[PDB]
Write a protein that binds this ligand. Structure first.
Ligand SMILES: [Mg+2]
Ligand SMILES: [Zn+2]
Ligand SMILES: [Zn+2]
Lengths: 137, 145, 146, 38, 48, 96, 56, 123, 185, 96
RNA sequence: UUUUAAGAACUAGAUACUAACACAAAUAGUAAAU
RNA sequence: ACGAAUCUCUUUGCCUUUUGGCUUAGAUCAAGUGUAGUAUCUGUUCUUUUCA
């Protein structure tokens, strides 16, 4: 397959033209947005990946799996702070979803950082959430 | 007339250009909005979110139900939530009366012979014969019961 | 301002003809909202009777809401208390699905109700004067945890 | 490639565009005049 | 293609009465000589 | 100018405002070259003016005579249903 | 000899490789990433700079 | 920081304000108010309409209807003088019909704040 | 309306020093040389009697994001090209700040709208063979120096200064990083 | 909901074995300049995090893949033109 | 650390698809016929 | 003893490449020949290990 810069180049251009055709006709079909982001990571170019996710949110934000994978896409490259700000935008966009709060917790427990998880459960309780929040706190 | 011709030679034609419903492209429209206006209701009887595949596939049930109604097939889907089935029956009754009603109106346009188009005739014979047979089988069944 | 609460499509609204606020239905839960601030104001006690096709407010603070299950549901406006329900006798030869309610409005006096129904007919509802308390009362006010 | 649509076109997509300036017929002035009720 | 066949029998006629069908007392028609001939036609009669 | 600016260079206006293709047309080049009821209507209209103004141009040259002038342009205004073909574009004009 | 970019179709046609398609700044936010970006750039220049020689 | 973290959402916006007291009062808004909002709107529309009429090409649709630069501090004064066209040439030399896509760009979020056992039988 | 409403953005230098000026207004003028969309174009001559007429080449949306005079296309505040000012500003700090702009067509058109500003803005013969030739020094500098104390062919590949002159009078006057030889046959 | 909880528990206990296993085998700063906040963290535990994620992706990916193998090899009843007949048709078997 | 194709030669036609190529000489994608 | 982690298998759950529109079922349904191009359907006979 690939030889040098120039071949890699053509191999990219072709893919991007193809996909974004297929996204051009379906704004929806989230899976497509995901896969295209995934390819974008495998090219070791993040900036584009960030965007591609963001666009994918501007279409639909209620679709959590995209939130999640746009987290893990930030973590698996071992860049955290992005995966924090993203979390503030996440739970703030959707407080009623547990999966976001729990995932942001685990992100702060595997980092051992407590001060957070204290103030964190302080919020996630302050909204009078439900039985499982208190129980887990 | 020319004023336009030359603003189009400079400024190019317009990109959006909506268009309008009209004589020819009518049914497609009527259909298209019908389908959409099922998909609201059936999207709101379902508990939460699950949509895309469930949706499309339910519409396929729509068409199938219609073209049953034509052929006079009684159409019972083996197992499927009652309310949904209610919705489909509701609409397909609605479309039904659109159809039969238009069949009368047009036939009584032809009998006068007042500017009915060509195919409109052939079609309307279709819609008739269908209706006539349904009357037939009805009349027999009640002759049993 | 956006008011995001409702859970799925928001299918109907109406304007209080006095109070300057707007009832917004939803599928199964019918809130009100204040203008100017875009407050919340109230939350009408409604189990899932929905799908709510329509709302109609009134001069006396009655509220109407039409179901597609074929049930008229009237409320007080101030409260949330639902003080009457009605199965709308569908029709002669109809199909049980064809009982539903596709619109509503109140005449300018506030005392007469007009609705259309998927069974090809209009019905007009009247406000029965006997009432008072005599044996009037409705469902009797046990506000619950929403 | 015959497919049931799943969508409709946002008017916004249009709204961003620059105009044209073609002149239709049905836009030519008619009934320039309102009427008020007592 | 079959539709095409029908026409061939048909034209003969419109030639066998050419000189009425094309004629110079015609009410309105824009006069054109044919290309390299000396015939004038009054208005378009495509078949002929 | 309008024509050559639509990149139709194989159509010719002669001096009498007939519009003729010079080169048997590839079908695409037909479709690209159908012209509007405008452009045609207007060409015809110019034709009429050219016709009249010509007859005068002649008489000034001294080649006719004032009676044959008057009769000429009479003949024109009556036989427009022939000399031009404007009735193809507005068919209404079949009142006049 | 450099490779062709396959022409254009509609005059505004996009060449996706050249520039970020429609560029969404992820956001601002509170946690000040800003340093992570240097490890990024270092890894991207690093990656591309590799492939030129070793050939993937 | 407790405020910094979840900053936007806050519980007072779930909580209905006529639960406490019925009779909480909401005034429909006066008179010499609606005759204001009516004013500033109506004017704004007349400016719109009068533009779009006086754009286009019915020379007779127009019948249906400043120094303005202090630049820098005005330093050099100025006058801003329209230049009469050549009425044959196109008006709006730059106008055209093109197509754009716009960034839908916003700063702020809109917390969407709402409230699989027996049901999958049904549905 | 609003097209007018962000007003011109203009240098107070290049604008020219007269007391009173008149400038035209043309509501749909050129498109930007940048975003490729229309706007209001403003002529004027600097001074009244001039032959040459300033025009304005860009939006006020586009000349804001980068913060520059629509005529000049220098910075507003510093009278300096973008690719300079944000380069200095790159240097102190250390590395950042350049403005990646817009190939394709509706990439740039699109990118015009969003309001983010941009890095720069963010803040604001006798053959004479003479050798030893320095890498960075031009010919203009060489014969510059010669005419400055009182005609050439250099090869910078081989760092060999080839040289010729009009009259050997300039031989004496020449002589009366330099390898001398007075070389001719 | 409940699933998200359960998963939270599972990775709790797993995290516990990470920390403890690391015992067995053996602040917050603000900028008055800008409202950006700055936390200080080990390059450790970020790598354990990322690696853990990667390995999860792996093992799940592989469960699904082996499931491809097994599932597509086994059932041989219904007619199949192609792969998707086998797929979909096994959905119709899932029905009843 | 991967890996086994039964190997080679001979032979005929039979069902198909097709081709603005060939039986006073000519037909095409709005319409077709006792 | 029990608890936990890891590998492997089974079952449930999740559905993983898991039917995308409308009109008179949208309409019609076999009448050839010569040569030529390509597709591919049978049989016959001999023979089953390795290194420089
Ligand atoms: Mg066709
Ligand atoms: Zn611009
Ligand atoms: Zn300037």
């Amino acid at each position: 397959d690939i030889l040098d810069l120039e071949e890699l180049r053509e191999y990219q251009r072709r893919k991007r033209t193809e996909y974004e055709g297929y996204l051009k006709r379906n704004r929806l079909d989230m899976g497509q947005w995901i896969r295209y982001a995934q390819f974008e990571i495998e090219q070791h170019d993040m900036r584009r990946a960030r965007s591609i996710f963001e666009r994918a949110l501007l279409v639909d934000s209620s679709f959590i799996p995209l939130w999640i994978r746009y987290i893990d896409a930030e973590l698996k490259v071992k860049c955290i702070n992005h995966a924090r700000n993203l979390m503030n935008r996440a739970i703030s966009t959707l407080p009623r979803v547990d999966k976001l709060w729990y995932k942001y917790l685990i992100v702060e427990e595997s980092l051992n950082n407590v001060e957070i998880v204290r103030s964190l459960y302080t919020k996630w309780c302050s909204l009078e959430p439900g039985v499982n929040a208190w129980n887990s706190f | 007339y020319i004023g336009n011709l030359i603003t189009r030679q400079f400024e190019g034609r317009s990109n959006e250009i909506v268009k309008t419903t009209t004589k020819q492209r009518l049914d497609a429209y009527y259909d298209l909005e019908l389908r959409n206006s099922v998909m609201d209701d059936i999207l709101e009887m379902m508990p939460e979110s699950i949509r895309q595949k469930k949706a499309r596939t339910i519409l396929q049930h729509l068409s199938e139900a219609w073209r049953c109604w034509k052929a006079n097939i009684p159409w019972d889907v083996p197992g499927m939530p009652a309310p949904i089935k209610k919705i489909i029956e509701r609409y397909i009754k609605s479309k039904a009366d659109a159809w039969v009603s238009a069949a009368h109106y047009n036939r009584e346009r032809i009998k006068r012979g007042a500017h009915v188009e060509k195919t409109m005739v052939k079609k309307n014979l279709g819609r008739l014969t269908r209706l006539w047979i349904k009357n037939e089988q009805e009349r027999q069944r009640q002759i049993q019961k | 301002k956006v008011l995001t609460h409702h859970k799925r499509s928001v299918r109907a609204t109406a304007l209080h003809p006095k109070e300057f606020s707007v009832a917004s239905a939803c599928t199964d839960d019918i809130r009100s909202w204040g203008l100017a601030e875009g407050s919340l104001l109230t939350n009408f006690e409604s189990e899932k009777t929905g799908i709510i096709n329509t709302l109609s407010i009134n001069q006396d603070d009655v509220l109407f809401a039409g179901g597609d299950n074929g049930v008229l549901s009237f409320y007080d406006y101030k409260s949330g208390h639902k003080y009457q329900s009605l199965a709308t006798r569908e029709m002669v030869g109809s199909l049980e699905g064809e009982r539903s309610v596709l619109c509503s409005t109140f005449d300018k006096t506030g005392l007469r109700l007009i609705t259309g129904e998927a069974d090809k007919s209009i019905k007009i509802w009247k406000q029965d004067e006997t009432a008072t308390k005599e044996s009037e009362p409705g469902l009797a006010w046990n506000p619950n945890l929403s | 490639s015959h497919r049931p649509q799943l969508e409709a076109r946002s008017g916004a997509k249009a709204a961003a565009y620059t105009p044209t300036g073609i002149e239709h017929a049905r836009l030519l002035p008619g009934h320039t005049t309102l009427k008020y009720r007592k | 293609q079959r539709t095409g066949l029908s026409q061939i029998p048909n034209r003969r006629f419109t030639l066998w009465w050419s000189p009425t069908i094309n004629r110079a007392n015609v009410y309105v028609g824009f006069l054109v000589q044919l290309d390299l001939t000396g015939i004038f036609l009054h208005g378009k009669i495509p078949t002929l | 100018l309008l024509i050559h600016r639509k990149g139709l260079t194989y159509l010719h206006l002669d001096y009498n405002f007939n519009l003729k293709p010079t080169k048997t047309l590839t079908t695409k080049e037909r479709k690209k070259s159908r012209l509007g009821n405008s452009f045609h209507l207007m060409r015809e209209l110019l034709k009429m003016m050219k016709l009249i103004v010509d007859t005068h141009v002649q008489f000034r040259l001294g080649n006719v005579d004032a009676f044959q002038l008057a009769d000429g342009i009479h003949y024109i205004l009556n036989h427009i249903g022939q000399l031009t073909g404007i009735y193809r574009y507005k068919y209404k004009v079949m009142h006049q | 000899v450099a490779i062709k970019k396959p022409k254009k179709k509609y005059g505004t046609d996009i060449d996706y490789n050249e520039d970020i398609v429609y560029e969404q700044a992820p956001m601002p936010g509170i946690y000040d990433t800003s340093t992570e970006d240097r490890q990024i750039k270092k890894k991207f220049e690093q990656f591309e700079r590799k492939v030129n020689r070793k050939g993937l | 920081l407790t405020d910094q973290i979840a900053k936007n959402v806050k519980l007072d916006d779930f909580i209905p304000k006529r639960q406490s007291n019925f009779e909480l009062s909401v005034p429909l808004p006066t008179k010499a108010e609606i005759q204001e909002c009516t004013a500033r709107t109506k004017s704004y529309i007349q400016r719109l309409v009068n533009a779009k009429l006086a754009n286009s090409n019915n020379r007779a649709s127009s019948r249906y209807v400043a120094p303005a630069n202090l630049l820098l501090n005005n330093s050099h004064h100025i006058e801003v003088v329209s230049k009469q066209m050549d009425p044959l040439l196109p008006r709006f030399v730059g106008k055209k019909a093109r197509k754009v896509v716009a960034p839908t760009e916003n700063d702020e979020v809109v917390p969407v704040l709402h409230m699989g056992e027996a049901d999958p039988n049904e549905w | 309306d609003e097209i007018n409403e962000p007003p011109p953005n203009i240098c107070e230098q290049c604008l020219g020093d007269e007391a009173n000026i008149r400038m035209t207004k043309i509501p749909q003028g050129s498109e930007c040389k940048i975003c490729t969309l229309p706007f209001t174009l403003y002529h004027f001559k600097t001074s009244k009697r001039s032959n040459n007429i300033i025009k304005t080449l860009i939006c006020v949306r586009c000349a804001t994001q980068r913060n520059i005079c629509q005529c000049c296309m220098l910075d507003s505040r510093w009278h300096i090209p973008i690719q300079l000012r944000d380069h200095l500003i790159s240097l102190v700090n250390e590395e950042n700040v350049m403005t990646e702009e817009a190939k394709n067509d509706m990439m740039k058109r699109f990118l015009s709208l969003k309001n983010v500003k941009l890095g720069g803005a963010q803040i604001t013969t006798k053959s004479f063979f003479l050798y030893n030739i320095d890498a960075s020094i031009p010919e203009w500098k060489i014969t510059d120096t010669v005419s400055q104390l009182l005609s050439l062919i250099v090869n910078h590949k081989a760092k060999c200064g080839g040289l010729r002159f009009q009259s050997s009078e300039l031989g004496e006057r020449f002589v009366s990083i330099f390898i001398i030889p007075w070389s001719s046959g | 909901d409940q699933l998200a909880k359960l998963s939270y528990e599972k990775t709790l206990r797993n995290l516990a074995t990470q920390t403890q296993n690391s015992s067995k085998q053996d602040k917050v700063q603000k900028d008055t300049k800008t409202g950006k906040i700055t936390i200080a963290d080990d390059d450790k535990l970020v790598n354990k995090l990322a690696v853990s994620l990667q390995s999860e992706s792996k093992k799940r990916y592989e469960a699904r893949k082996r499931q491809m193998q097994n599932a597509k090899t086994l059932y041989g009843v219904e007619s199949f033109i192609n792969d998707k007949n086998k797929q979909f048709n096994e959905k119709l078997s899932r029905e009843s």
